[PDB]
Amino acid sequence: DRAEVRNIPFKLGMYLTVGGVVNSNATRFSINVGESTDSIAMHMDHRFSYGADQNVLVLNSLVHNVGWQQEERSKKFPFTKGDHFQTTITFDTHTFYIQLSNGETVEFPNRNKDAAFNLIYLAGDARLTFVRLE
């Protein structure tokens, strides 16, 4: 299905590094940190071509039985279809700190003030090749 790491708690102070490859002809893919596929505290979507969006990062949270919240966008997009990427995420109770392949960073509020997450998954047009959660 999607690539996932489930029930190995990602807690305050730990770091998550995932690596993978973007598909040729990818439309978009995302990395998701939350509780379930319908309860996502940090959704980071990588849009190569999606609607009017081309080469933009879109960040949001998804609340169970409620839906997507306010989107934040970033123009930082060091991603190429067919190539590798590496992303590192840490968080405290206020902020998710994300670091991209080229060293650039994006920050996104921890809207629920959560301290641990039991599901990490990738969905869409990419695949993961390694993971470190420690």
Add this chain to the structure above:
Amino acid sequence: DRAEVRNIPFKLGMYLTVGGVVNSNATRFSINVGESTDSIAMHMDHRFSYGADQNVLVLNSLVHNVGWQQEERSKKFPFTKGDHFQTTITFDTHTFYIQLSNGETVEFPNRNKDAAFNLIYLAGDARLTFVRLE
């Protein structure tokens, strides 16, 4: 459910290190590398008290719609209920190479000559706290 890493391919030449904690009053827990919960190429069961087995490692494979194969056992058991453990696994097409917390090793045949595995999970009376697959 169980703690699992799914669809991040564990291929020939990569290393998997998992860490965790054994429950107090644990009966047994296992680490499983395979294709599904019914197709397991390397099952490593840690038996504190299970039937007549007390403080023994039992290794086996499970074949889909067929069942467990020939068990191999090891008397190497540096595990304590309530405490941490760390295990590293690598494999080539003939052998799974396992290294325990204290440096001891156990080897188990790669019976199917498989080169990649899409599911790693822990089941039973323990929990995982970190994972590196790279």
